[PDB]
Design a protein around this ligand. Structure first.
Ligand code: IFG
Ligand code: CL
Ligand code: CL
Ligand code: CL
Length: 499
């Protein structure tokens, strides 16, 4: 009875692990006449409609969303110790009630509810159920405010619908930020009016050659809107001064020798660089950041800064000193890979650490020092949360430069005491980046993202006290029937006792 269990799954069997789980009493059972009661507000009805849409296919039930009556499933906004993202979920014969201070909290409560329901809930056709929800109370709040997932649409382009699909994959685990790597050596993916060739030429191909693609301003706005409806703040990234071949290939003038390099379709990194000693370089950067900021309602703008190996150290520092202010000029908070820690991060900046266990102490120290100086830290170790990294030497996709990363390694660590000497209060959260040098279709993205994706979400959300591999692997194993029913391919790691 893997697909439709006789009894409801345990109230605590969800990922991320909730801050507090108090099981008790009889469960709730959704029946054909169940109504979804919401507050008389746009934001409330929005979450209600979202929930109804998730349940209607598998249940076949009408599930009307109303602001009147005493519905079996109630979403209510009220005061409480749940912050901007927390919630309380009560379940019993009298119904299921999700209470929160804001819509994001109700939304997160819904993500928990879909895991309490049986795997059959993932089907597209009416199923017998039973639609049971374990009885008891869950009180849940997040540990970190920065819980993100990154998708690389530069190495291989993924259209709006494919990005929406990935957004739905991450929404399941309460991630709240979506980092989009919009430009790199193999492609420029956002239309810039002031420099039309970036998209038309720079986005004309991708890794492996052939058609590439890019988002028009309208398409980008739609991705941001969809992400927002899934409570994901979009953090766009235009990498500089390295990983800029797509731009360089589009405009000869940006190159130090005034010659446009060919479009790049390989899989190497570190060979490209904007010309730091040219004035046009800064006009270009200002134009791009300005246009991108205009399309970004979110608070952050990622300028990259990684692997600028063709940029002399002194030029890299000079470049970052000149460009960081441009982000603030357009009203945003700058974010950069941790290499920025070596180029005097501006006040309010955040750096994304992608180092490894083996990283030299001097490098770790530079980042820890930035943290001491007030720079926020986003942790995404390449040998921990890089979803493109192979599980073992036999993984058919992905890379291996950072060694192998099985499920336990990806999960078994504590963000608070990870980077030696770094103040715990400087850690803003975590991120799970999915690079696409080796991935060209949605199914391949799933195979590399799952089952490690839920684990990184837990590190960002759950209390340190709930962290434990032996018990976590059981909660992860329980996801198998849900993913199978949902058509989500995943690596069946031998470290996990799959249900
Ligand atoms: C910050 C960063 O990660 N830069 C590069 N490092 C290796 C990756 C592959 O695992 C991608 O090539 C990525 O663009
Ligand atoms: Cl999904
Ligand atoms: Cl090459
Ligand atoms: Cl390389």
């Amino acid at each position: 009875d893997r697909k439709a269990p006789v009894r409801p799954t345990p109230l605590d069997r969800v990922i991320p692990a909730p801050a507090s789980v108090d099981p008790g009493g009889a469960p709730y059972r959704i029946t054909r006449g169940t109504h979804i009661r919401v507050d008389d507000s746009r934001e409330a009805r929005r979450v209600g409609d979202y929930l109804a849409d998730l349940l209607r296919p598998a249940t076949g039930y009408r599930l009307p969303v109303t602001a009147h009556g005493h519905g079996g499933i109630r979403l209510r906004l009220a005061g409480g110790p749940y912050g901007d993202e927390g919630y309380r979920l009560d379940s019993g014969p009298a119904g299921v009630t999700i209470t929160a201070r804001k819509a994001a909290g109700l939304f997160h409560g819904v993500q928990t509810l879909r895991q309490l329901l049986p795997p059959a809930v993932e089907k597209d056709s009416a199923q017998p159920g039973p639609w049971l929800v374990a009885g008891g109370t869950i009180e849940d709040t997040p540990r970190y405010a920065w819980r993100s997932a990154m998708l690389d649409v530069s190495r291989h382009f993924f259209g709006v619908d494919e990005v929406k699909r990935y957004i739905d994959r991450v929404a399941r685990y309460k991630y709240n930020k979506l980092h989009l790597h919009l430009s790199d050596d193999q492609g420029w993916r956002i239309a810039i009016d002031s420099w039309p060739r970036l998209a038309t030429y720079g986005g004309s191909t991708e890794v492996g050659g052939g058609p590439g693609g890019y988002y028009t301003k309208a398409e980008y706005k739609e991705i941001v809107r969809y992400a927002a409806s899934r409570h994901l703040e979009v953090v766009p990234e235009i990498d500089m001064p390295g990983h800029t071949n797509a731009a360089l290939a589009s405009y000869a003038e940006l190159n130090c020798d005034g010659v446009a390099p060919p479009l790049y379709t390989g899989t190497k990194v570190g060979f490209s660089s904007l010309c730091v000693d040219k004035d046009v370089t800064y006009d270009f950067v200002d134009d791009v950041i300005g246009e991108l900021a205009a399309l970004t309602p979110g608070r952050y703008l990622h300028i990259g800064g990684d692997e600028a190996h063709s940029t002399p150290k002194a030029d890299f520092v000079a470049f970052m000193k000149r460009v960081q202010p441009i982000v603030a000029k357009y009203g945003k908070t700058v974010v950069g890979w941790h290499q920025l820690a070596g180029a005097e991060p501006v006040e309010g900046a955040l750096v994304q650490y992608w180092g490894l266990d083996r990283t030299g102490d001097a490098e770790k120290a530079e980042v820890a020092e930035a943290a001491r100086n007030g720079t926020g830290l986003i942790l995404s170790p390449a040998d921990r949360t890089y979803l493109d990294m192979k599980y073992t030497k036999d993984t058919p996709l992905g890379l291996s430069w950072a060694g192998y990363v099985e499920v336990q390694r990806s999960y078994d660590w504590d963000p608070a005491g990870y980077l030696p000497g770094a103040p715990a209060d400087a850690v803003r959260g975590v991120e799970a980046p999915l690079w696409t040098e080796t991935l060209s279709d949605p199914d391949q993205l799933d195979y590399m993202a799952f089952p490690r994706l839920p684990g990184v979400a837990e590190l960002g959300w759950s209390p340190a006290s709930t962290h434990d591999w032996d018990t976590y692997k059981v909660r992860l194993a329980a996801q198998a029937p849900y993913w199978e029913a949902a058509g989500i391919d995943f690596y069946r790691s031998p470290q996990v006792p799959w249900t």
